[PDB]
């Protein structure tokens, strides 16, 4: 179980892998052209990022 927990998460966590996971915290300037493209322009993983 420990090994599956540590391996199901993506160690390289490239782009879309960050959307599904929630353990790692992430963010940027609030509405500083970062999530302005994410509130609109619905893209699946980008929509998860906006959410």
């Amino acid at each position: 179980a420990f090994l599956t927990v540590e391996r199901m998460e993506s160690p390289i966590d490239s782009a879309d892998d960050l959307a599904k996971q929630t353990k790692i915290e992430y963010g940027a300037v609030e509405d500083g052209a970062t999530m302005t493209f994410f509130k609109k322009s619905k893209i699946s993983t980008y929509d998860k990022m906006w959410a």
């Binding site: 179980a1 420990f2 927990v5 996971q21 929630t22 353990k23």
Partner: protein
């Protein structure tokens, strides 16, 4: 996503009871073996 919990006493507690029951049954049947 938080599941890194070991097999603690809550996870496994009845093993002590079953081993104690086995021990007491073993001695209770061994004392009658001599008779």
């Amino acid at each position: 996503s938080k599941e890194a919990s070991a097999l603690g006493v809550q996870n496994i507690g009845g093993i002590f009871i079953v081993l104690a029951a086995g021990l007491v049954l073993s001695v209770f049947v061994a004392v009658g073996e001599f008779l």
